[PDB]
Amino acid sequence: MAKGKDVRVKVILECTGCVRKSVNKGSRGVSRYITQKNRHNTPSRLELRKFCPYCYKHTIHGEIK
Amino acid sequence: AHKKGAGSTKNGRDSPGQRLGVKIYGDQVAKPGAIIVRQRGTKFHAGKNVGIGKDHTIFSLIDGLVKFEKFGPDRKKISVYPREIV
Amino acid sequence: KMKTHKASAKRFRVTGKGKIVRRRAGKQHLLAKKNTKRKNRLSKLIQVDRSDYDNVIGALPY
Amino acid sequence: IAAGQGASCGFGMRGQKSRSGPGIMRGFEGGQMPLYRRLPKLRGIAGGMHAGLPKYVNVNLTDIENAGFQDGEEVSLETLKAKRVINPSGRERKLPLKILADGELSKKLTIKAGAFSTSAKEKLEYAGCSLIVLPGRKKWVKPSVAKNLARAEE
RNA sequence: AGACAACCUGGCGAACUGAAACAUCUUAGUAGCCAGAGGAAAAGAAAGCAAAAGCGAUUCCCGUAGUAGCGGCGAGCGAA
RNA sequence: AUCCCGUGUGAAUCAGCAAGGACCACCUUGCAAGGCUAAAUACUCCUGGGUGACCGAUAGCGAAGUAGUACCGUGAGGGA
RNA sequence: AACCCAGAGCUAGCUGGUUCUCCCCGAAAUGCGUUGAGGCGCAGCAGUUGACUGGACAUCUAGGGGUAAAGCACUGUUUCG
RNA sequence: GGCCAGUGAGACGAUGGGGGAUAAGCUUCAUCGUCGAGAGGGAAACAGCCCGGAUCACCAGCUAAGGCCCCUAAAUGACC
RNA sequence: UGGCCCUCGAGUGCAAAGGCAGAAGGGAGCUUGACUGCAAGACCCACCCGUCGAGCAGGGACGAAAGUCGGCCUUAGUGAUCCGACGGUGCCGAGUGGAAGGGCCGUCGCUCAACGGAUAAAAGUUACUCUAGGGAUAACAGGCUGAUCUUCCCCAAGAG
């Protein structure tokens, strides 16, 4: 969104593992355990990074398509 | 809100910037000197980034912690009087 | 038989040696964004100096 | 005996009020203890264990069964104990349970009413019950209880 | 009717002050105004509590916790 | 939650209903919609006896000698 | 925006006052915060009590930080040729 | 480590630096000493400057700082 | 563009100090520890709090390998408490079995800046003034000091 003194918002998303959970939260306005912050405006969309969650180690991560 | 107008700087500071321990001493694995934070690891005192001549301590204690720019980083191991029995 | 401070009892918890082991701060849900290997070093420590007035409050509650 | 109060007369002529001018009237706790000292509260605030817990420690310190009605000389522990009892009168909790401690053990013994742990199994095996750790190789299913104590029904 | 000394039931109902500010809250449902009755009133043998053990009228005293719980969970109040 | 209500409505009714601090099932207990009921419990003008390391007429109740009089204010009231 | 009584002996980190005697030791008026800075809380400083070759002055050995001074290659200035 | 404190607007002189004209016993920091919580001796009289820092008595001596014509004790002492 | 002199006098995301060409400088491939759980020994604060950190346990990336990485050259880019939303966790859950709720793990909301933040929410006058105190906080004035002001004086081109 347009940056400036008016109506701003921290572009902070999450990265949930594929068909898994843990090390991440799922709600209306919540962030993962690592608390990732995208750019939104800047060409992004579709985030993902193989991280090591609770169950086992290293997976896929990266929610919000 | 943020103020603006005719005025100079303000607010004092303090790192601080001193030296812990010194040459020839039971320098434990603490952090000698450390004028600035983010100091990398060093398994000894220090002795670099300054006039010719390396520094050395009489006793060591499993690794340590000294600045990255001044005094350091890590090179040769120094420890007068081998810490061993018999 | 004195009005024991409640808002204080629900916080500290006298260990055993009469020490007031107060949990860390800024840990509750953090509310401080990311902390990187910081929220992990948050457990339960003990207070000093001022502790000589925080324990006297709940003298009865022990 | 009498540090010197009773009034304010004598030497140095006391003047109270800390001799400065704070709160001449007692009770004026300068700087409330709550604020500035009310650090994050989380460790304390809990759900509160249902168990009444009339005694921080278990029933006692291994003293059951003894010459007298202080234990009923039958090893049961209910509410008819004097020397050693969960409460001066007894009967006001839920689960008993007990561990080892001071005392020359007990000649006679017949532990009952739950209770377990090596504390009262390997040390109190001289009579009544004993220490028996149900193995986990017999059955293919997960281990059956951490420690099972014989003679203690449920 | 006593233009009724206190205690008691009922109707109505503050502030100062405390919350080191103050409109929530607390401080007082006290003080104060008014009505009635007894010398005791009020309450009282229980669609209770506890519990699957059983107790079992109300009221009063000592404990159980001034814990639990409630509250800008702040002050403060305060169960069973 | 429950108990007592202003207002609009308002079921069942004992092989039925309520309560168990949301609700629901089971179980258990108790069943009020009308009333009476001694004692333990509170306080005191006043009565009789007695007690008190309580004071002693600038003390103590304002009043231990015909003062809450004499006086002040319109008065309430204040008050040697 | 009263008079009199009652809660209010209200509140009053304000100010003033605060009534026998001897012995020993001995403060501070600073820091960190505070709608906080003529207020205080914590810490420093004082007194008391219970444990510790724990410390201070001086000599020697063993380092660094780099003021004064000086310099002024570099940064920012500077006259004559 | 534990119990009870007190005090947070201090002042001045020397020294090393910011403010002001390097003007102020002015103001704001650091350091030492004094006053402030210790007199007295000396600067005529000036707490903070100097010497010295008071358990007490004593018609007891010697000194520090400062002085030695008189006034209040002490060289119009010697040499240039 | 080529050759020569090529010496923090360049470049470091942004202020500035320090440091750096064994490069964090710059480019490219692979990747993405911008890792979880802990962590001897210490620094920084009255406290809260802040900062650094070898190694250990469970799994990966790069290189042949040794080996590095728990963010970005470092230092700011921020703010506790309480009330709450939501996931996980059979921890608990006042008759029992569940549930609601609470607890625990994880995250989010407050130019709460007067930002160690008193409220979810609050601007002015008072010459009608009143009360509690002080000149440590002003006005007249004394005093210290006194650049300015007043007076006098030095050198001296010139007017006369």
Grouping H, G, I as helix, E, B as strand and the rest as coil, residue C54 is helix
Which chain A residues in 3-22 lie under 8 Å from chain C, judged by CB atoms?
12
In degrees, to the nearest 5, what angle opens at C-alpha D54 toward C-alphas D132 and D48?
90
Q: How many CB atoms lie within 10 A of CB B29?
A: 12
Determine contact, residues A45/C43, Cβ cutoff 8 Å. no
Contact status, residue B67 vs residue B45, Cβ threshold 8 Å: no
Q: Residues 40 to 99 of D: which have CB under 8 A from any C CB?
A: 40-45
Strands (E), chain D: 131-132, 148-149
Q: Which of residues 1-60 of C touch A (CB under 8 A)?
A: 33-34
Q: In DSSP terms, which residues pair with A29 in a beta bridge?
A: none
In chain C, domain spans? 1-62
Contact D21, D58 (CB under 8 A): no
Q: Within 10 Å of residue D41's Cβ, how many Cβ atoms?
A: 16
Q: D34 CA, E80 C1': separation in Å? A: 29
User: Distance between CA atoms of A35 and A23, rounded to whole angstroms?
Assistant: 10
Distance from the first to the final alpha carbon of chain C: 13
> Do D44 and C11 count as a contact with CB atoms less than 8 A apart?
yes
- Measured CA to CA, the distance from residue A64 to residue A53 in angstroms comes to 17
Task: Assess if CATH 2.30.42.10 describes domain A6-65.
Answer: no
Sequence-ordered alpha helix ranges (H) in B1-86: none
Residues of C in contact with A34 (CB under 8 A): 34
User: If we measure between CA atoms, which residue out of D101, D148, D147, D150 comes closest to residue D125?
Assistant: D150
Q: Is A38 on the interface with C (CB under 8 A)?
A: no
Q: Does residue C56 belong to the interface with chain D, where contact is any CB pair within 8 Å? A: no
Q: Which residue is nearest to nucleotide E68 (CA to C1')?
A: D48
Which helix (H) or strand (E) segment holds residue C52: the answer is helix C51-54
Resolution reached, in Å?
A: 9.4
